[PDB]
C-alpha cells in the first residue's frame with residue numbers, strides 16, 4: 001500500500017494507519033459522471049422551495065451525526081475536538097442559513113428595458129467538480145456544496161486523500177438527508193482522474209481550494225477545457241498593528257488568528273506588521289500569550305492546538321523556519337519538531353523578519369508567527385501589500401479614518417478592522433493575486449455557478 | 461512584410477492591401493505595461509462621478525469621429541456602412557448609459573451582519589488585458605472597456621491583426637476624451653507577446669472574444685497564471701419557430717438574425733429549427749427573403765450585405781458548406797464563392813440539415829442559414845440544445861407559457877421570445893458550454909473585474 005496507488009489516512013497524533021482506499025478506476029469515474037448527469041437533469045427541474053427544504057434536511061442529518069463527524073475530523077487530521085465540533089455546527093448552520101436566505105437571491109431580476117420586456121434569470125449550470133483540502137474537511141465541502149446544490153447544480157467532490165473517512169461520512173450525511181443520487185457525489189480520483197473529468201462534457205465548472213500549485217495546475221486545465229473555475233489558494237494575510245491600537249484586543253485577535261486550527265488556515269494571520277512604537281510591547285505580549293497555549297492530544301479539550309495534519313508538511317514548515325533563521329530572523333519561541341510519534345510542532349514566533357525572508361514570502365501553514373517592524377502606517381501598508389498572496393487582512397488602530405483608508409488600499413478580498421478575521425455566510429469570501437479569484441458565500445457563492453440568463457420578450 | 465512579422469489590413473471588397481504594422485517588440489511591451497501600471501495607480505484613486513463624466517467625454521469624442529470610424533470599419537472588414545455607423549452610435553450611447561447608471565451599481569452593499577459592521581465594496585482589480593476580434597471592431601472593445609474603466613480598472617487592448625486601423629482610431633478617440641495613457645492602452649502584440657503579458661504581474665485578469673480555439677489557448681494560460689478570465693467564444697444559436705408563430709415576424713427576425721453583419725455575429729441566428737406543420741411555409745418565405753438581400757460594395761448603402769472579412773474564412777465557410785452538402789443537405793440558395801477580387805459569399809440556405817452535419821455542429825460564421833425540421837416543440841428544444849455552443853436563442857410561438865418553459869430549459873445565456881436577438885447595455889450577455897463563461901453588460905460587466913471586498917469592523 002503506497003500513496004501512488006491508494007488514498008491513505010493516518011492519525012497525526014499517533015502515527016497509526018486508519019484506512020486505505022484505491023484510486024477510482026476508469027469505470028468508477030464513468031459511473032460517477034453518468035449519475036451526476038442524470039441527477040442534475042432531474043434536480044434542475046425541482047422547485048426552489050423544495051431544494052431549500054432539502055438543505056434543512058442536510059442540516060438535520062449533519063447534526064444527528066455531529067459527534068461522529070467531529071471525531072472523524074479530529075482523528076484524520078488532528079484538529080482539537082472542540083474546533084471540529086464547531087466546524088460541524090457552523091456547517092449545519094450554513095444549511096439553514098441558505099435555506100432561509102438563498103431562495104430570494106435566485107429570484108428573477110427586473111431590468112431597465114421598457115414595459116418589463118426583459119428579466120435576468122439565475123439558471124443552473126450543471127455538475128460542479130470540487131477539489132477540496134484537509135484543513136476543514138467538512139466546512140470546505142459544505143461552503144460550496146450547499147449554495148451550488150440550492151442553485152440547481154450537482155456537486156462532485158474530489159476530497160484530499162488524507163480525509164477520505166471524512167468524505168465517506170459526508171456522503172452518508174447526504175444519503176441520510178435523501179439527496180438524490182448524482183446530485184451529491186464523490187470520487188477517490190488521482191490527479192489523472194481529475195484531468196479526465198475536467199475534460200468531460202458532464203462537468204460544467206470547477207472549484208478548487210488548496211495550494212497555489214494545485215490552483216495553477218487545475219486552473220490551466222479548466223481554461224483549456226473552456227470550464228469556468230473558482231480558485232481559493234491560501235494566503236499570507238497581514239495583521240497590522242498601529243501605535244494607537246487597543247493592544248490587549250490586538251494581541252488576542254493576533255493569537256487567535258495565527259494559531260486557530262494549529263495555524264492551518266488560508267486566512268490565518270500570518271504576517272504581523274507592527275508599527276515601531278508599539279512593536280516591543282506587542283511582541284512581548286504576543287510571545288507570552290503564544291507560550292501559554294496548551295498543545296497535545298486533540299481529543300483532550302484542554303488543548304488549544306493539536307498536531308499538524310501531515311508529517312511531510314511539518315517537515316516543509318520546519319524547513320521554512322530554518323531558512324528564515326538562516327536569513328537573519330530571530331527565534332523567540334518554539335521552532336523545533338517535537339520528538340515522538342505525533343506530528344507536533346510547538347507554537348513558534350520569528351522576529352526581525354524582513355520582506356526578503358522565506359517566512360515573509362511563502363505561506364506558513366502551521367503555528368509559526370512572523371513579526372515585521374514597520375516605520376509608520378504607510379510603511380505598514382507597503383509591507384502588507386508586498387506579497388504574492390491577497391486573501392484577507394487585519395488592521396488594528398483606533399483611528400477609524402486611517403483604518404478605512406488602508407482598507408481601500410489593501411490588496412486583498414477581505415479587511416477586518418479591529419476584530420477577528422473569519423469566514424461567514426453573510427459576507428463574500430475569496431481573494432486576489434495568487435490567492436485566486438471568484439467569491440464564495442452570501443449571494444456570490446450562489447451565483448458563481450449559475451447560468452445568468454437574459455429572457456427578453458417582444459424585442460421588436 | 462509577412463504574416464509572421466506584421467499585422468496586415470486588406471480591403472475585403474477589393475483585395476487591396478491597406479496597411480501593415482509590425483508586432484510590438486520587447487521594449488514596446490514593457491513600455492505598455494509600465495504605462496498601464498502607472499495609469500491604474502492614479503486612476504484607481506479618482507472619484508466615480510469624475511470617471512462617469514469621463515465616460516461622457518468618450519461618447520462625445522467618439523461621435524465627433526463617427527464617420528471616420530465607420531468608414532475605417534467598413535474599409536478594413538467589409539461591414540455595410542450603415543451597420544458600421546450603427547455600431548458607432550451604439551458604442552457612444554453605451555458610454556452615456558454607463559455614465560448615468562454605472563456609479564450606483566458600484567456602491568457598497570449592506571450585509572445581514574449585526575450592527576451594520578460589514579459591507580461589500582467593489583474595488584478595481586488592476587489592468588485587464590483584452591483580446592478582441594474583427595467582426596465589431598469598435599463595439600467589442602467598448603462593450604468591455606467602458607464598464608472596466610468605470611470600475612477603476614485599466615484596459616489594455618490586443619486587437620485582431622486585420623483591424624489595426626480601427627484600433628489606432630479607437631486609441632485616438634480615448635485620447636481626444638482625455639482618458640490617461642495606460643488607463644486605456646493598446647499593443648500590436650503577437651501571440652507570444654500576449655503570453656508574456658498574461659504572466660506579468662502588471663496584468664490582473666484577461667477578457668477574450670473570439671474563436672473557441674483562442675479561448676482555450678488563452679484561458680489555459682490565464683488559469684496557469686492564476687488570472688481570472690472571461691471568455692465569449694461564439695455560438696450556433698437556435699432559432700425555433702412553432703406552428704402557432706407569427707410567421708411574417710418570425711421570417712423577418714430570422715433573416716435579420718442570420719444575415720446581419722454578413723452573418724459574422726457570435727449571436728447570429730444560425731440553426732433554424734422549424735416545427736413540421738409550418739416548415740414548408742417558413743422555408744419558402746425565408747429563401748425568398750434571403751434572395752432579396754442586395755450584396756456588394758459596402759460603401760454603397762443599397763447593399764444589405766458586404767464581402768466577408770477574411771479570404772481564408774470565406775474558404776473555410778465554403779468548405780463547411782461543401783461538407784454539409786456531401787453529407788446529405790439540400791442547397792436552396794447560394795452556396796458558391798463569387799469570382800473576382802472581392803471576398804463575396806452570397807446569401808445561402810441549406811435545408812434538410814440533420815444534427816450530424818457540419819452546418820449543425822460547427823459555427824457557420826457567414827451568410828449560411830441551416831434549416832432543420834422538428835416533429836414538435838419538445839423535439840425542437842432537444843435539437844436546440846444539441847450543440848457544443850450556448851450563447852443565445854430565439855423562440856417564436858404565440859403560446860407565451862410554452863415560450864417561458866422552453867426558455868427555462870434552453871442551455872444558453874440569452875433567450876428572445878418573438879423578437880430580435882441583440883446585445884444591450886441593460887441586460888446580461890454571454891453564454892455557456894463552448895460559448896464560454898462570464899457575463900458582460902449591465903452590472904455584470906462592471907463587477908466581473910472587481911475585487912469584491914468584505915470590509916468588517918469590530919468583529920469581536
Ligand SMILES: NC(=O)c1ccc[n+]([C@@H]2O[C@H](COP(=O)([O-])OP(=O)(O)OC[C@H]3O[C@@H](n4cnc5c(N)ncnc54)[C@H](O)[C@@H]3O)[C@@H](O)[C@H]2O)c1
Pocket residue numbers: 131132133134135158159160161190191192194195209210211212213214215217218232233234235265266313363365
Ligand atoms: N487554501 C487552503 O485552504 C489550503 C488548504 C490546504 C493546503 N493549502 C496549502 O497547500 C499546501 C500543501 O498542502 P496540500 O499538499 O494538501 O495542498 P494541495 O493543493 O496539494 O491539496 C489540495 C487539493 O488539491 C488536490 N490536488 C493537488 N494537486 C492536484 C493536481 N495536480 N490535480 C488534481 N488535483 C490536485 C489534492 O488532492 C487536494 O484534494 C499547504 O501547506 C498550504 O500552504 C491551502
Ligand SMILES: NC(=O)c1ccc[n+]([C@@H]2O[C@H](COP(=O)([O-])OP(=O)(O)OC[C@H]3O[C@@H](n4cnc5c(N)ncnc54)[C@H](O)[C@@H]3O)[C@@H](O)[C@H]2O)c1
Pocket residue numbers: 591592593594595618619620621650651652654655669670671672673674675677678692693694695725726773823825
Ligand atoms: N465570438 C466572436 O464574436 C467571434 C469573433 C470572431 C471570430 N469568431 C470565430 O472564430 C473564427 C475565426 O476567426 P478568427 O481567426 O479571427 O478567430 P480568432 O480567435 O483567431 O481571432 C480572435 C482574436 O484572438 C486573438 N488570438 C487568437 N488566438 C490567440 C492566441 N493563441 N493568443 C493570443 N491571441 C490570440 C486574435 O489575434 C484575435 O485578436 C470565426 O470564423 C468565428 O467562428 C468568433
